[PDB]
A paper describes a structure:
Murine Polyomavirus (MuPyV) is a double-stranded DNA virus that can induce tumors in newborn animals. Viral attachment is mediated by the major capsid protein, VP1, which forms pentameric capsomers that assemble into the T = 7d icosahedral capsid of the virus. Sialylated oligosaccharide receptors are engaged in a shallow groove on top of VP1 formed by loop structures on the protein surface, similar to other polyomaviruses. The differences among the three strains have been mapped to amino acid variations at two positions, 91 and 296, within the receptor-binding region of VP1.
The laboratory-derived RA strain shows limited spread and induces few tumors of strictly mesenchymal origin after a long latency period, while the naturally occurring PTA strain has disseminated infection and causes multiple tumors of epithelial and mesenchymal origin within a short time. MuPyV found in feral mice has the VP1 sequence of PTA, but the virus is controlled by an intact immune system. While RA bears a glycine residue at position 91, this residue is replaced with a glutamate in both PTA and LID. While the receptor interaction pocket of RA VP1 has been described, no structural information for the pathogenicity-defining amino acids at positions 91 and 296 in the pockets of PTA and LID has been available. PTA and LID both carry a glutamate at position 91, and this side chain is being held in a characteristic position with the carboxyl group facing away from the glycan receptor due to a salt bridge formed with K186, as previously predicted.
Residue numbers in the entry:
A (entry chain E), C (entry chain B), D (entry chain C): 33 to 109, 116 to 316
B (entry chain A): 33 to 109, 115 to 316
E (entry chain D): 34 to 316
């Protein structure tokens, strides 16, 4: 159904669905143990640095990846399709960053006093709602970065060849789809503006090392998903795709300034309506 | 109860109510004595730091908590009526007090112990809500290993009767509560729950950092509309109106080992309500 | 007249009045001599600090206070009242902060070179227009602060009793009216949102120690004073009240980092119309 | 032309005029030689500081002044007058601040390495369009400042008397008109909000010492000059007055941190229409 | 040229897309990641003046304008016809792609813990410059420099001297109307020299912003939901002369800083354009 017709009316013609996507900062959800690694859930493991200009081998659990979920919608089948009309979305838990009583690098390092330095630095917030996987365009800081072959999907996973210098700019060969949760690094894979005809995405980036994190939250804000012609994302095979990443910055430890990324979960409440298509 | 009909007209069909909620930064309102602890009212007590990666036990009087009040509305009740909250004028009062730079805080010139008394700076957090039932809360913490006190505060373990788990550092749907007591629910634990709160409107913002300048605006000319996309405001169950807030401006820092004290300010609410026919 | 009726028409039914309010930062307008203290006019005197946690005695001339003026309107008397419809207001003189050639603490303290550090830090801008004095609510940093009994109006002035711990939050007992220029400290007295039914006020605060000052100015911006029912402040006994404070930050001297508050004057042009009342 | 009537229609009833105003930061346009001082054109000369609290004698070529031009409109003469309807204005050249390869104070002063520090600090942008000279109100940081008598127009030029302490706040005696380019210091002379009935002005100030400069530029933005009654500035004797100042901050040299103000030129394109007047 | 009605019928509206890669200083070739290709997307190390009178920046340290000319379908069989058709640019969706890549703080840049050579690899920070333009002819440029004494290379960059055949004059540090050019070549016009000319560009829309400083956090937004309208105050978009559509941009994110003498390299990001065009009758 490529030709969009009238809205469907009658019993059950509109539905609301909700979901939360937890962040994928590097430590997986398991093991759950708060001694054996689970204490880092919601965070990355300690960022490991390159050893030379030609030896940059980041560990998978130090690389934040995209969150995604595919939600199955009520069975439907001139055919009908589910059309995503609007979304209320919220990043939850910023108040938790008011914990300045922990064991991070303290504000008075001479005397080991003050407060536990709160999360600060680079921030990245993107969400998307669509009727098929988010289309991704690869672009990296360094085409020489030696990403692991297993456990992450990177440009080489797709091309079966090493990255080239064009991958540090826009190389149309380096494309993928966001089809797995916690696998696609956000430092590699960006929303592709040349595709995503059936997805809406919204992103912002704020960089720096000690930048104050900023966040707003309210249950009163609706994001309209209709395009310029009044048509929202159309859900292929009754599948709805949610994608996001919400990085708040890093915490810094008392030992060699080890940094850990902090991510927060995102709530989605999507309103959908049935649409006649041909 | 559930089905929303026409607006009620006639004598006393609209009312305005006002309240102020004082901040709950850690030191309680009593003792009142300015030498026995009352001098910290409006502030937290000095923030105490973890002693290791596995030993983090913050004292309750160092943890800002939610402010809340339940206000009783005029009695009501062929068919039923409910009070509907239409709009609110809200204001955080007292930012001018932060222009006191003549006190005994850590001074700006630490070479000569001179300059000015460093004003309140750092992390800031402002949330308010108005609803017809308690604000629904979702728990989420920095560290599921934090040893919150088991007395005098409501934490995740209070609700679940079990220790926190690693999922409590992200979204764990088991870890939920209702904001039903003033000065009891820490803001570093309990967040507005976007999966509930159908009958409350909430508005929040967070700005982090350690030395960030505090910013605030105030005017008596701004109205916040509380009507939803269908033109319906919060409906007050059992004629109860719930106000919730927290307004953290940052910390002051003392001259002794950089002890930080949170500063909070009071929030004014003036709520306009109308009677609604319901079925 | 509590009941508001129709607008009055005919000759001289609309009037426009203008005024400027000079800042009240601590040094009075006199003595005028530029060697006897007049050189500090527009500024506070050097901020003096507490000597202990229990001994905080700020000098009056170090405390910025509210500016205010009561303007008399044309005689009038179903009666008529003057109704304030709108105001054009502007803070004048921000360009003067571009003087970085004076004798302030220099930007290179190592060598005593560079430029004279410009005014920076905490900023506070409030104005109000009303038909009666601005209603004030007291709230202080420290209820133990030992304000002078003479020369400033403080909480103790009103209550005849020492401040209490509730005065560090909202204590409804601690209220006053802005009825005198250069007397009510801005670190004590705030617009009262529980009153001021017949006044409109607009305030903003930006804190910190070295924060860059920011200001906009134009003669093209009108502030509407009408409430949600289309009614502006009604001038009791044909008196119009103007209130403000405009703090730009501090300058810092070359001697023990002594700080002086800087304030700027505010212009008001108020449009008023006659209103029938009963 | 006190009473404003209908718009004039017919051939040549609307006109557009354009101009650029170069900045007046302190070094005059001549000498042109890049070894005789011409290399400082667009900049001030090195800011010279006071030698004590009572000895502040800034050199004229260290003080940015207002730019202005009077443009002659087509001859006209119930009479007709030119009415300025709107202006498109832009500050040109912010990209030049991306030169970080010069000999300014370097970013690493420990090793004398890094990049040439770009222009930073206090910024001031004002423009005005009017039918007569911009009305100015004097206000200074320090009434004791010993401005040169020749080569700048200062408060003493107007009053024939030394500045008074009231000149540090609003002194209504201290007024002038912007009638000469490169002569009225911006640290003294501000748009007068109590006059300028026939001019629109728009100003902003951002202070500090190392503040990042910010600028936007586009050819798609129109500033409407009509007042609340739908009347723009009326050009007396067919003269159109343009006034501006656009300070981007300072560069800092490698010798004693000497600062030089940087200004940029401003483009104006003004649309005017003929108006019947009586 | 007099602008008449919109043309209707099959194929009267079209959308075209393009990406422009940044031109920060290292050219796209050599492609080898050991011979210079590893710097593509970046400048080479910024080299500094050696005195107040000796400022000779290398070409590969100077970011230049990106541009592309797109050729649209021919509309007019006979240009002597009284009424003709032109392509009119109505709107553009534009996006700067790849800000997420700046979240790589695991490389070999100057580290944040300089005592121990630990912490994180300092991310890109500092001065930022974002400009894009869409027009029916080349972007008109106005020259203006920091220093008229700067000794730009004569070969490899188009500078004021390239145009005038004479050394820069002191007026080139402000607005000198003699110092004008057109953006007619990609990767050649330095952005520290050449600015959109507000006195021309009647048939182009440009949008620019500058944020300065040395350690300023970079900020960027991106969405596929934002349309930039290109119609002027009369409802007319850029009209494509000889069916040529010109895209111009620069998108500087700041610098990375190396572990060797704090050497800085500019970082740029590519820009996507999707332009909606419609046929317009003209005479």
């Amino acid at each position: 159904g490529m030709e969009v017709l009238d809205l469907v009316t009658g019993p059950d013609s509109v539905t609301e669905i909700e979901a939360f996507l937890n962040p994928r900062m590097g430590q997986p959800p398991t093991p759950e143990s708060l001694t054996e690694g689970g204490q880092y859930y919601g965070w990355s493991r300690g960022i490991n640095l390159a050893t030379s200009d030609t030896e940059d081998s980041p560990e998978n659990n130090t690389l934040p990846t995209w969150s995604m979920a595919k939600l199955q919608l009520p069975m439907l089948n001139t055919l009908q399709m589910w059309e995503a009309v609007s979304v209320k979305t919220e990043v939850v838990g910023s108040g938790s960053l008011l914990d300045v009583h922990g064991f991070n690098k303290p504000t008075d390092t001479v005397n080991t006093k003050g407060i536990s330095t709160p999360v600060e630095g680079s921030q990245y917030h993107v969400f998307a709602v669509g009727g098929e996987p988010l289309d991704l365009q690869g672009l990296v800081t360094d085409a020489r970065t030696k990403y692991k072959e297993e456990g992450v999907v990177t440009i080489k996973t797709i091309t079966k060849k090493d990255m080239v210098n064009k991958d540090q700019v826009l190389n149309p060969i380096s494309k993928a789809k966001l089809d797995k949760d916690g696998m696609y690094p956000v430092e590699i894979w960006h929303p592709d503006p040349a595709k995503n005809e059936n997805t809406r995405y919204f992103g912002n980036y704020t960089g720096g090392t000690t930048t104050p994190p900023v966040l707003q939250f309210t249950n009163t804000l609706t994001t309209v998903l209709l395009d310029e012609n009044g048509v929202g994302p159309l859900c292929k095979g009754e599948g709805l795709y949610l994608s996001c990443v919400d990085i708040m910055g890093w915490r810094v430890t008392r030992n060699y300034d080890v940094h850990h990324w902090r991510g927060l979960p995102r709530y989605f409440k999507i309103t959908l309506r049935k649409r006649w298509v041909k």
